[PDB]
Design a protein around this ligand. Structure first.
Ligand SMILES: O=C1C(=O)N(Cc2ccccc2)c2ccccc21
Ligand SMILES: O=C1C(=O)N(Cc2ccccc2)c2ccccc21
Ligand code: NA
Ligand code: NA
Ligand code: NA
Ligand code: NA
Lengths: 494, 494, 494, 494
């Protein structure tokens, strides 16, 4: 059911992509990109700066010209070009699953079955929207005819993160291009390969010159350049809440460009006593350990009800110690390395403070190999709301288990965060599921599951987890501008 | 707290309504409407036949004419009129509720608080839609601009039944008038009175003449004249499954007019073992005995799981025996009389048929008063699928209780029926409520409740319970005609 | 962009198509299908009837069983099967554009570049709708949670005409399968071949057995068997009016199956004094002479304003004589023959009836070749409303030009007609296009163009040209059954 | 016919409105609001600071608590409450108009017939939306049922300007309250009077306490206090760019709250050649001078074709010259005074800068009156692009007239302002209509009319002019939080 991977794939693209050609930086500066399993360097990558972002934007501003072949083309053809791009990604599935694992470190089995599959369904879901987002004819008062046009907002700066580098890419390109925009994309320094290669596939799909430009570089230079740029019409950022504050400040101190954001979470997974014990344990484990725990809506607060707390813990611990950490290309590996040096140390430091503040280390706690950035699956029990490990997104394989008495208690506690990206309820009981699904403050609630995304279901956050929505039809709003036309007519008849 | 009803309200409106003016029938014929509590004549009503229907349709067509006040009026204003109409019905709420009880027989208290409240809410809900039913601007291939207009269908023939006279009038006028149509209404000869007094309010509210015309009379005459009329663009019938067939034929025979039907049902009410026993009993009883059993969506097939069957039956019988039958102007009464002698005899026959086929009579099953049309609340136990009473709609205070073992069994048993209006499920388990709400072939699935309609939420039949939908946004579709305008433009840009 | 055709291409498919397998009739009868260029028998095709249809429905029913492969399949997958089909038809597009031109009669060039291009656009448009036709969540009164599900209607009997036998097939199958219904299709006896080959691509595409089915034959037996089947949920019929009335009666007398119909037309094309003379002239010509005059919205009433009547008429008569008539496989040819001899003689009888009534035959006349069914492009001048060639659907290469004086005049003259499928308006003025496009009683109004369809923009008939719509989001409405689920929840909070 | 004014209306409310009750500030300070038609301080108004904004916010948060009267109300009831409010405003229509004119400058015949007309239509339209904004059920892959809830975004801080006081209050409360939010409102220091009277009606209508809260104060203080609160979920600014780019920074600096904006513009009113002259002149004259020229999308870049400039410009000055200035309570008065001193000398400051660098002054010139902030209607001609008068928004009765040649030319010129809130196109010809509306960058494009706002049609600007739209179905998005619930089910069917 899963083909073999090439474990040392050839890197073809490592430059700034503009007008469908390859560029070295103005400054000529470069940066190495590392393989988190061994810690070794994979290759050098073009470090895009202030003025390389300025270049990317002009080739994009020109792709968006009234009369240009992109502004003119049929909406259903923009679909045809999206579908084409997914056909070719499907063709190079193995190589793209392998390359993602080499630079990101996720198990190869997941790259192929999870990432790239959801890459395919997403792109093919937006292809079919290309010619289906309607404006309105509006029965205004008086002798007028009025109607709306959902036009493209224009040149869209997209800054994407390192955890799901292909899936984030497609989540951003999905709607932008479906709706006729053009995109200046900044890839994460950590994982910039897979994205640049798809830029070759964006060429071969048939996308006009400058529809898509991709600028590798650092946050404080490239990232902040796009956010400040006086001719960029919109900027979408996913990543830490810290860094989102700089993105919304620059966007106000520039050109009143629209903003969207998808920041972290401390998402509660709430297990009522009537849950299916066995289902809830495999799902709470998956909800936190998935993708090495580098998940914006990782279930990092596992709230369990007292009547069942002890059995749940003992099982979670057992499941945690039996999780295989190892070579992400090996078929049996359930957990690969963290993403870089910086994340490795950050996590160890959280584990440290979990220990300092009196949480019960129940397994793991340590470095899981001699080479790479592998951390042991770690579970803390008896966690209290006031502990640092119960307020801050670790973004690693560290589970926190909290005990609750009543449903009115757990709702107040669960909802007691600066974040609200996601939450989940486990229960067999209909009133319970309904009360909680309504009372919880989260962009997405899951009932008897976790991380169930489809390209169809919208996704975003409340509070300081972000604003606006990705996936589904809602994803289209923030990439659309509304124009109203109101025409005097001889005599309005119903 | 309901005000004190005048038990003999005066009748001010007993003629044909055309062009905001009152008329005798061309033949000057009248028929008597009866009080089913007493069996005595309230008054004589004008008998509309073909000539009168043709007059009404002509008035209606004249009002639909391009450049008429009704066609030039702003859509927001159609909404003001419905709000004004709603406020006049509230002003006169005490009289109408007394008149409904007099003519139809339902308890004054139910008429005041259930029926009259739903009329106001339905009319208020549709007042809001009037300027909110958008067409679409469509992203079509080539250098064209394309858009839809939701234009009214035109002259709408509406035929309303007798079980809920005022409410049915609002469910048909509400969505027809909000979209800008004009109506010719046939009200039932058992209960024409409330509808003619509302026509009086229609005029006060300011509706241009000919927008609503109402013809009291008989069905095989006035009702068929509407269905066969060459200048009627649409017919909405609610009534017996048998007459609905006649309505769809005449419409095929005449001018291919549009059709939506609401017909009878034999709705399943399903009760699992883990349902809250006392809530289920009180609801099941209401589901069947409401409005004297005279409900298209009546829970006339109460399946009950074997572990709780005995206790359920014993409780259900008890509440059946304490249900109070008598004068509907008295606040102690929960059940007035059936609407007329025909339905009376029909129900008397259906109970005898019950006894013949081997259903167990557990209470009632005979006559309750020496005058009027009162029948005792009847319960039949150990009912089997093959029994005539399990298969055909009595439309009376006669409960059928059947027994089942597994959830899967009862899905096929509930569904195997040519009717599919509504259904209900009583349980506490999330999974079972979803399984069954998915599997039942019914236009409405109530979970742990029954007879809960919103002005906001669609209602209608599967199979031979009908086609088309009533209330919500969906109620507007069958009253709208789509026009596509496709203009050549110089050069299409996104 | 046009290949070369095998002009007696191998017929692999001429039987009944049930469960992705082929069959003879239960009677073992057959009938011939004729080439309209030559009149010779292309092959035999099995003659289905009540018996076979009854076997199709029973396969369609079983593929629609709850828990079947087609029912449980993801919504996104139905889209993949449709998109695949489009890819297969594109791979046999050359064999199909030829076999279309062969059996129907139209010019290979028009067959390949118009028909199949639209067929591919149709199928890929509807592919995308598959996972996009949302139900709603509804903020009802009280402590309830209320939502709707858009569910398939079931087994849909589909009956298609001979004038666009591929495209008509695609217009029906697209919507039906995207929303997951099962089909029992009767095809035209004059053009069954194409529909049958596409079925083999349906199997090859991977659609489960019993999902899409086909029964070639004669309407007065098989056609009407689909129409009256106790277990067909829906009968879409395209064709004449007379048959549509028969259909709507067959539904009324049987299981109350829903019904949409696409029927005839006498569409007006209206030239204002300030139109673009050359464009208008060339568009008017195509508007009637497209597909040998066998289009439902053929602009078969050309209204011309009096200041330009003379100027317009000569050009049109000149343009009509210039129109090459010959073998459709040739490339000089702009017009091929009529579909069969029954129409051949009908149109001839219409042309006599024209001269006889005093219309000025201005060019053309009768037969245009001594083999096949070829007729001369024919213009009648000075035409009047009371003339049979201005009221009845000729369905052939006969123009009609009529003089008007005022915009108020032509409104009334264009509407005064029992059909309402399409109309067109030619003008440079803004107020005039708006005045006319509002005031014309047509399901589609084209402005400075004609015949501009697309899977996107909806199509259907006012009055007696149809009920219900095809194409766009509107097509899905007829193929969906709406279900309301209303759930009692603990406490409703906004 | 317009009811008799009260030239010096009584004043009742001048304090801070919190929890349905009145309060003076913490510092107990006040300030003056001027009758700008004389210049005499009308009355004193509590000067609000940060700490009173923090009391309103706490009052709103309590009102927004799960289980509170507001959060548990039926969506339909909120609609009932908005309609109630509109009925209270309508009963007081005479007096509110008078109070508005007093503190604002605008003529009584506009305050009553237009501003208040628009207030009423807006509230009533939104009352209709209260229970019709639906979420979605979504056909996701796998055995899940996924659905979206459209939830209140939360505590919304609402700052409105002085140029259309009451209306702008109406545009904010309507959508926000229909969707169940709670309001913290900062009215203008210049015009706090009307907007504070409405709160008294809000109490009377019966809105629970803290749903709406209103704080008169300062731009440097109150404005940024709301913008920076850690408990304000969302803030909507309406004003100018300078002031609007502070709001975007302080919101990010606080808690990443949602921001919608409405800002200034330099709206281009393009009069074409083949257009009508009587209508264009009168309307182009309407586009700017309305409401004493204090008008965000006022038309001040008038591109005339060089076939008509002279003859167009001729009539343009006469009407402008003849435009009456005077007492705002005299029915012949079209134009009133400006609202404050700053604007007065600033508008005079704008005048000077024009002629300086080549601009012909055609009438008015300067100060209209001895007493007040009045201004004679000034008009310029010969204006070129790069001047102060054709780049910066004057917000006063000061017309600019420019000149163009070809149709491609004027586009680029029209699309060269750092703004784009509205635009217009006076033409007769369909193509010039469809082209110019299709390629002008603007939120609204009025054709042959100007300042046509329906309560139904969305309204907001391109680029720097604003984010999101106000009015229409798009007004509700800003006030809505989207939650997805995704439930595991037994077996997903279609
Ligand atoms: O935790 C996450 C996650 O954040 N994303 C993507 C995402 C990115 C930003 C915001 C929300 C979701 C995922 C996709 C698949 C499985 C788990 C997850
Ligand atoms: O010209 C305008 C205008 O700009 N506004 C308000 C507005 C505010 C911000 C953005 C756009 C319009 C108006 C309100 C009423 C009547 C005329 C007008
Ligand atoms: Na790395
Ligand atoms: Na009666
Ligand atoms: Na043939
Ligand atoms: Na004054």
């Amino acid at each position: 059911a899963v083909p073999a991977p090439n474990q040392q794939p050839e890197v073809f693209c490592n430059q700034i992509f503009i007008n469908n050609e390859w560029h070295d930086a103005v400054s000529r500066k470069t940066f190495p990109t590392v393989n988190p399993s061994t810690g070794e360097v994979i290759c050098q990558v073009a470090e895009g700066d202030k003025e390389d972002v300025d270049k990317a934007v002009k080739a994009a501003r020109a792709a968006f010209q009234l009369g240009s072949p992109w502004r003119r083309m049929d909406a259903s053809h923009r679909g045809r070009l999206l579908n084409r791009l997914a056909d070719l990604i499907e063709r190079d599935r193995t190589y793209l699953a392998a390359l993602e694992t080499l630079d990101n470190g996720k198990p190869y089995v997941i790259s192929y079955l999870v990432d790239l599959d959801m890459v395919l369904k997403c792109l093919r879901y937006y292809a079919g929207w290309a010619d289906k987002y309607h404006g309105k004819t509006i029965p205004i008062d008086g002798d007028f005819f009025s109607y709306t046009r959902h036009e493209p907002v224009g040149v869209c700066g997209q800054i994407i993160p390192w955890n799901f580098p292909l899936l984030m890419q497609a989540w951003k390109l999905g709607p932008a291009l479906a709706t006729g925009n053009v995109v200046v994309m900044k890839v994460a320094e950590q994982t910039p390969l897979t994205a640049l290669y798809v830029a070759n596939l964006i060429k071969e799909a048939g996308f006009p010159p400058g529809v898509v430009n991709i600028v590798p570089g650092f946050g404080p230079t490239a990232g902040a350049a796009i956010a400040s740029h006086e001719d960029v019409d919109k900027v979408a950022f996913t990543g830490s809440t810290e860094i989102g504050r700089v993105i919304q400040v620059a966007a106000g101190s520039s050109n009143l460009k629209r903003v969207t954001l998808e920041l972290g979470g401390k998402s509660p997974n709430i297990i009522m006593s009537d849950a299916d014990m066995d289902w809830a344990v495999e799902q709470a484990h998956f909800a936190l350990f998935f993708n090495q725990g580098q998940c914006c809506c990782a279930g990092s607060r596992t709230f369990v009800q007292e009547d069942i707390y002890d059995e749940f813990v003992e099982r979670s611990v057992a499941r945690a110690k039996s999780r295989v950490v190892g070579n992400p290309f090996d078929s049996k590996t359930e957990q690969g390395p963290q993403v870089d040096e910086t994340q490795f140390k950050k996590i160890l430091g959280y584990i440290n403070t979990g220990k300092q503040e009196g949480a019960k280390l129940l397994c793991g706690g340590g470095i899981a190999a001699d080479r790479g950035y592998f951390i042991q699956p770690t579970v803390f029990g008896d966690v209290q709301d006031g502990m640092t490990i119960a307020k801050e997104e670790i973004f690693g394989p560290v589970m926190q288990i909290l005990k609750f008495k009543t449903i009115e208690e757990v709702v107040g506690r669960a909802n007691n965060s600066t974040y609200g990206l996601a939450a989940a309820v486990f229960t067999k009981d209909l009133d319970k599921a309904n009360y909680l699904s309504q009372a919880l403050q989260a962009g997405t609630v899951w009932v008897n599951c976790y991380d169930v995304f489809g390209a169809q279901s919208p996704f975003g956050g409340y509070k300081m987890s972000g604003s606006g929505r990705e996936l589904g039809e809602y994803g289209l709003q923030a990439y659309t501008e509304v124009k109203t036309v109101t025409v005097k007519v001889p005599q309005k008849n119903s």
